[PDB]
Design a protein around this ligand. Sequence first.
Ligand SMILES: CCCCCCC[C@@H](O)OC[C@H](COP(=O)(O)O[C@@H]1[C@H](O)[C@H](OP(=O)(O)O)[C@@H](O)[C@H](OP(=O)(O)O)[C@H]1O)O[C@H](O)CCCCCCC
Ligand SMILES: CCCCCCC[C@@H](O)OC[C@H](COP(=O)(O)O[C@@H]1[C@H](O)[C@H](OP(=O)(O)O)[C@@H](O)[C@H](OP(=O)(O)O)[C@H]1O)O[C@H](O)CCCCCCC
Ligand SMILES: CCCCCCC[C@@H](O)OC[C@H](COP(=O)(O)O[C@@H]1[C@H](O)[C@H](OP(=O)(O)O)[C@@H](O)[C@H](OP(=O)(O)O)[C@H]1O)O[C@H](O)CCCCCCC
Lengths: 475, 475, 475, 475
Amino acid sequence: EEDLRRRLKYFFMSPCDKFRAKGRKPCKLMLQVVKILVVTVQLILFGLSNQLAVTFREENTIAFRHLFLLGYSDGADDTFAAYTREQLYQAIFHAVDQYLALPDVSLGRYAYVRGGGDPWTNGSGLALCQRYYHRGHVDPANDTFDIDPMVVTDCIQVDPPERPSSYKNLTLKFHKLVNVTIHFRLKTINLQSLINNEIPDCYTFSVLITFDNKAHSGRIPISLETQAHIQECKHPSVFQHGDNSFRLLFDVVVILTCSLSFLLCARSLLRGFLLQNEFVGFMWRQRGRVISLWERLEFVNGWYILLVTSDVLTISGTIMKIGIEAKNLASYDVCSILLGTSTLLVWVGVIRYLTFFHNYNILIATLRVALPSVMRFCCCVAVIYLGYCFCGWIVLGPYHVKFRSLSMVSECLFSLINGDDMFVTFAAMQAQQGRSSLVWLFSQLYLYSFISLFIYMVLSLFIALITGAYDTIKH
Amino acid sequence: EEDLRRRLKYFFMSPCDKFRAKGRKPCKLMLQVVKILVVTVQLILFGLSNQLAVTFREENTIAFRHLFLLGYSDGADDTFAAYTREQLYQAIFHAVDQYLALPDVSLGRYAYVRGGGDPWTNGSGLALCQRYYHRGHVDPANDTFDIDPMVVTDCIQVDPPERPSSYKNLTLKFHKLVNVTIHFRLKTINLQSLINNEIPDCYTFSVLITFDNKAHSGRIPISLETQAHIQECKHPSVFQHGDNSFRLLFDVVVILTCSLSFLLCARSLLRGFLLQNEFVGFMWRQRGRVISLWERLEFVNGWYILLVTSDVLTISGTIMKIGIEAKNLASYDVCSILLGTSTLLVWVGVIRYLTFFHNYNILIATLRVALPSVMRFCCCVAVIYLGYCFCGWIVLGPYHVKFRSLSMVSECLFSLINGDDMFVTFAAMQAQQGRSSLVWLFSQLYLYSFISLFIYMVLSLFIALITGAYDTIKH
Amino acid sequence: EEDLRRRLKYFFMSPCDKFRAKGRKPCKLMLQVVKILVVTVQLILFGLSNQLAVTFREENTIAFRHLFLLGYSDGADDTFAAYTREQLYQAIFHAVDQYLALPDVSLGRYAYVRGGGDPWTNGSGLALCQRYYHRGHVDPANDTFDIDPMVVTDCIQVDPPERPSSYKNLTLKFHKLVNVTIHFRLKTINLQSLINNEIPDCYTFSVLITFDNKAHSGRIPISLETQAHIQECKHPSVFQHGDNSFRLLFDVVVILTCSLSFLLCARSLLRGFLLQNEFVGFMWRQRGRVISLWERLEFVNGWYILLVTSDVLTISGTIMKIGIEAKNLASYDVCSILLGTSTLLVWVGVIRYLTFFHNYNILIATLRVALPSVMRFCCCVAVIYLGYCFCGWIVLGPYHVKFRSLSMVSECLFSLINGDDMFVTFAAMQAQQGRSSLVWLFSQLYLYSFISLFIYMVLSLFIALITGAYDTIKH
Amino acid sequence: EEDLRRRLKYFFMSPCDKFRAKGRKPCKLMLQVVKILVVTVQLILFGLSNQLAVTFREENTIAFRHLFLLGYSDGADDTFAAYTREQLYQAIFHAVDQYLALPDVSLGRYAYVRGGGDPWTNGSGLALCQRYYHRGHVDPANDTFDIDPMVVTDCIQVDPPERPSSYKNLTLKFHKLVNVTIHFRLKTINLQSLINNEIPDCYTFSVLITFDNKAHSGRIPISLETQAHIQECKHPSVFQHGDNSFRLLFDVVVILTCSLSFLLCARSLLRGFLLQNEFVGFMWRQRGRVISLWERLEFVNGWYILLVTSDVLTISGTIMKIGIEAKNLASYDVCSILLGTSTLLVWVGVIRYLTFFHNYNILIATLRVALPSVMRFCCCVAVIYLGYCFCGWIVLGPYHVKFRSLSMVSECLFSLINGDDMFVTFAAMQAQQGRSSLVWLFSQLYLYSFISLFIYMVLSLFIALITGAYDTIKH
Ligand SMILES: CCCCCCC[C@@H](O)OC[C@H](COP(=O)(O)O[C@@H]1[C@H](O)[C@H](OP(=O)(O)O)[C@@H](O)[C@H](OP(=O)(O)O)[C@H]1O)O[C@H](O)CCCCCCC
Ligand SMILES: CCCCCCC[C@@H](O)OC[C@H](COP(=O)(O)O[C@@H]1[C@H](O)[C@H](OP(=O)(O)O)[C@@H](O)[C@H](OP(=O)(O)O)[C@H]1O)O[C@H](O)CCCCCCC
Ligand SMILES: CCCCCCC[C@@H](O)OC[C@H](COP(=O)(O)O[C@@H]1[C@H](O)[C@H](OP(=O)(O)O)[C@@H](O)[C@H](OP(=O)(O)O)[C@H]1O)O[C@H](O)CCCCCCC
């Protein structure tokens, strides 16, 4: 280690001491602080323009359910059904009649589509379409029954009248019926153009009223769906982008700064890998076998690859965010996960700046020496944790509601060891103290042996390992 | 210990070192890993075929309550009652009339039983049957009252009409009335034969509408019950078991592998007990009294007896699971507990493989040296815990709802020390700050002295014992 | 300490070694174990006979509210009111009319009182009585208003008809009205005489329908109350006490055993105080000042005074429990607290028997050396805890519901540091983000600075003191 | 340090030893104990007079909603809306008609205002006023739309009749409509003058029924507001202040004692700063550089500046509390925060008296040596905590309700790591397992990685730092 002392210790420096190392004037770190401001402001003024459009989306549907569903009070979304045969007729007819009488009874001023799509013939806007099997004769007590999947879409066409038909003539064939759907579309004008100060968006909803009968169980649920397909509406007017282009040319700063930091930080990655070739031979091997691909690991800094990671996502995110002016994408999920996961991972990079101080390094490196020991034991618990998830899903599965699928059992058990919704699950078992009294006595032994296992002997390790690691770092 | 060194140290080995011990090629452990795949897949494809039949069971009843109970909205299962005398007449008659008019008003296409059982004469399908005392004259203010239990079942017979009677003529004798029941049966065809791709099941429900009056309290609850008695329905058709026997001959692999592992693991149990006779005398006793029936305990390995235990349950479980093709059992509880408790106890056997590594052994043996000290102290707490359960059941028993039986008090207190449903129980006491103000002041002193006892001086031991044991294992 | 070695070490012995001390055959401890069986069985068969009578009490009232209150659905107990002036007339008249027509419309077979009490003239059973001021002329915009408390009870008398009056002629004088009450009584026969196998109880309810108007706020609540005054009903019949006196002469065993143990244990108290006079002078004082009234404290054993305490309560409790055959007391609170607090304090005496073993003594004496240090710090927290209770009661008092009285704030805060009903109280503040936006910003700073104080710096002491005490006891 | 030994050690004394220092008779500390009684009694008898007026305020509104809102049942405050066009007409007309018929149908005896304010012409009491745009022609499918904010207030005037008009003639112009408001006022007399024993307050409510349509979404919410403007009512009567001035001249004791303590405690502040000039030079500097502005910090006692702080707030608070007799302020927030924050901060001053004992000093100074290390690490967590708040607000923002604004996300996450409302947020995500199945899989990974981070590796530090600090203070 004679002549490589100066260059291999420059790589192990800190910008508190780089200032007095060779006089570097470290703006190569200060640009990373600009991301903390610019990406978050890119994020916050993306969220507020998106939130205000969601409340317009999720409140016209609440308007539509009080106009298109017969007897719908509030709250009962998923428990709204039709049980008789004439409850199903009055539900269908009331949904059509309000559509034919929309500008007289409803406020809000919608207007019809006069569409040209696939489940509509030309002129037609509303179409109620049955679905039933091709040929099928099911009959209990004479069990000569034929089932062949071949569904026929019998649509009934109706267009809205222009100025102030035979759909009432309708049979349904219930013993073969699959589902009855209703399709229509409605344009409108958003009228929140005042706090935007300029020309607003212009919507087109797409309603699907669904009379679904899959289970053939004598109970038909009733649903409603919308998709706000947004595009701009026709105008020859001007003066809109006096301030609007001051948002349209802000993401170009995000395009600049994250890319210019993607250039800068990777050059250090280019520097660190380049300086590996010299330490390998290094005296025409003297020690030789001491380099072992884990002593190679402390060359590439883990903070930089995290800063490279966000900048891949961030400039991929904001280039997708450009698709709000004229691009026909409604991909409000892919553009949203990329921006949030960047900001979730940009802000954790601040902890690096806290480790430059001699006090805060103790608490963070306490996590670093203990993150192995927790992640070892977290595998020891997850094996037992998957044991109770498969056992509780079969025994307590048929009789209850919370324990029906694995994605609920892994939630109803995991929310239970922290101490939440515990008495409610004990109270739901005691509708079975008469009905099948073995399953009750298993459920008392299942639940008590689980909640008194993870708090009293598993949670205590996670307190003991960190205490056991905090003694090592300071002595 | 001269000549027994090699054989008594082979028994204390590990399959990480058995490979270099004598060249054994340890497939005698790899067969145990096959259970992890086969039993779980035996479990998961048992659950999904069982779940889909439960949702058909628990949704035809929800259909039946909206057809057979007068004025039943959703949610109010247990608080649905009839209070006047004419609420009870209109509830009975509406339950019969919908039965006589089922194919005209209900969708789902049920059909009648035309039964031959015990609470039905021949031809009859529906039977409403009173229950009242033989002779009894209760009268307040003239208390010459006779009570002798001798109940008479007065049934009224009615059969459904074939093509498009005197039950309206009915008296009830309320001062002697016990309960009025209604029995009928309905066959149907499940029509979820598409994702099964073959001939579906064919059900027969059994409805019991119960007008129960036990307490004679001027309030009659109303109930409904079903039991889906399933059997196959008549067909001369074929092509069903092109893929269905590929489930019917999968459990035979579970029959093979768990049994072949029941043969293998017990041979080591046969080996361990056989090698006990030599260590007893062992030098025509030299030490003699040192063997003390607890130094005998570390011979039989505790992991093997757990692997024997599941294989008893597993091949007993899956042989009961064969009763789904043609066996008339509906025993969906006994066959379910055995399979789940096996899988709960098969998956914990994976922890043995984690103890072969030098890191994971530390965390597990920390539990093993601390499982005595916790189970000592768990007896010290349960004595005090049963103290508050008997004290709170008498004082707070009459005035409240959660504290009515011991099986609720042992739930309402145990869910309370973890911190769940705590404010709701404090809020329920304050309907008694005027009504009997001593019981209120006891309830503030009962609850505060209990929740501030188990968190602050009992939960702290369970954190202290594990920390106190983690120092011993690593130093 | 020459000649007092043998007698002063006999007093420091254990019954594990008293057997080999002088051959005592320790039945003077085994009688204390008899209490564990006898008092608990005295308790459990007191609770089950009491529980079954409460469900008859609290279900006839639920019957009465569905017969006597106009438009009462379930659940809405405390939010049932009458707002107009004709809602109050229809509520009163419907309550009288159902009383006049009770045997025709209600099941359950009640019967009238034909009473002779104070708010009833002779023959009369029902009495609706106004309450209003003597003389008062309140008038806004002409504020010459007189208020003098002198209330007049104007009752209207009505008796039930015998075989198949002017109360409809009624004015109420609302501007002076205080409350309108309705009183009647109803006898009945309990008919759960079958599982008792003998002659049942015979009740007399006392209904009070209350139209309370205290606040004069334009909103009158409506209430209902009962008191089941129980006594036996008339009979010349016999054969009741073939098994019933086998309960009536079981408490005499509780009278025996607790008293015979009250005699035995106090003789040791008589022995311990008697042996104090000798240690005082003890060598015509040698050390003298070393006895300091805290070294006197370890003479009288703390376990015995607890066993004396329960036996005072237990034989006082069960002698009050004798008042269920013929004594006219309804004191079901005083007799219940004494029995439960005994059993709560009898069962903690079992821990003494656990301290005879060398293992369990460590965990219990860990509590004993740490019970000072916790109770010191519990005073340090309660000072700060009363600080937030007075601060939160004034600021957040007017705007919310949970924070209205101190008895709720001491519950809503104490249930909050354990982690229960936390988000619901944060959600209730955000109806004030527009209404008085200073109180909102205080409420975010009030709640966050409190819940993040007691979990993160106060709960951690209670874990640290016990860990800090567990190291002292074992080293 | 020769001659300044006596004076610089008098400043480091305790009143347990000041009694034997120079014979001081320490009433200069006992006056501070008088505040504990006087301020709290000033607080409690302020709260009870304020609480009783709030329940009169918040129960006349509950009366008003059952009289002025068409079809308002209880509970549904924020979900009460009008969806058709004729639901809006029947809601307006029913609100006017009940106002015109108030003394005939309502109890409580209100009376009209006959007002003279700004949204009322002379004589008029009720005024329903539209709001709509000046000129605007919005039309979908012909998008020549004009929007200019210029709102016109078209009021309709109506006065109540004196002894036993054209507002029914009304159009609304819905396509331009903004909001319809209704204003009126009602005086009354509180009649809770009995427990006050003297002349009560005399109120004037101000009702605002709001038909708000901002979003133009086809859904109009309906609201109600009151402001109880209180002043005294006209009387020539006397005898009121026989006991009432015994409250009016109690706050003057609070004016005395807190001010006389503000004089006393600040003289010690005047003493401590005065004695700093001597320690600076102190030997014409010998050490010189050892004084470093943090060794200056232990001169001014931190307990006194807290006692100065409350006395600033307390005498500012109670001088604002004088504004309840005749001052027209309704500022019941500013006068309330000052009194509560004083009492919150007066009561923490009691801990100083606990530190005079040798036992309680250990627990408090354990907090003092650990309050740095917690507040260091609390910055390390809040950086990561703001990361998840920005990430969860965009991804889970559109699809759910709890995650809509940052002020809820900082509550829904912070209430979640303590273990409250955890399963309810997992259950709300599973309405999206079909709808946009990427956002579901992110939500399982978002929530699990957060709740299993702060309990298992962040909560454990807060237990480890206090344990790590409790070892330092006692060894
Ligand atoms: C000049 C010829 C003789 C050299 C003899 C002395 C060698 C000595 O002067 O050092 C090498 C020097 C420093 O530049 P390096 O990048 O090689 O080394 C580190 C830098 O201090 C920072 O990077 P930079 O500011 O350059 O972007 C950064 O703080 C670190 O990484 P990090 O903290 O993780 O970000 C490292 O990367 O390189 C060249 O001579 C630069 C030449 C000047 C720039 C020319 C163009 C304007
Ligand atoms: C006999 C004359 C010479 C005495 C010389 C030896 C003295 C030595 O033999 O000891 C004193 C002896 C023991 O009786 P004591 O009661 O004085 O001393 C303890 C007893 O062992 C237990 O009480 P006991 O069984 O009596 O109810 C009890 O275990 C302890 O208290 P505790 O564990 O807290 O419950 C102590 O109280 O007293 C008398 O001589 C008893 C005489 C025999 C009974 C006569 C009537 C049947
Ligand atoms: C007298 C001339 C020769 C002096 C030589 C001895 C000097 C020695 O006697 O000491 C100085 C003495 C004590 O008074 P000081 O205030 O200077 O010093 C402390 C006092 O013991 C308390 O304050 P006090 O009771 O006065 O309000 C208080 O306990 C402390 O502060 P704290 O505990 O934080 O509250 C300190 O402030 O001052 C003057 O001589 C007082 C003169 C008598 C009062 C005259 C008017 C009635």
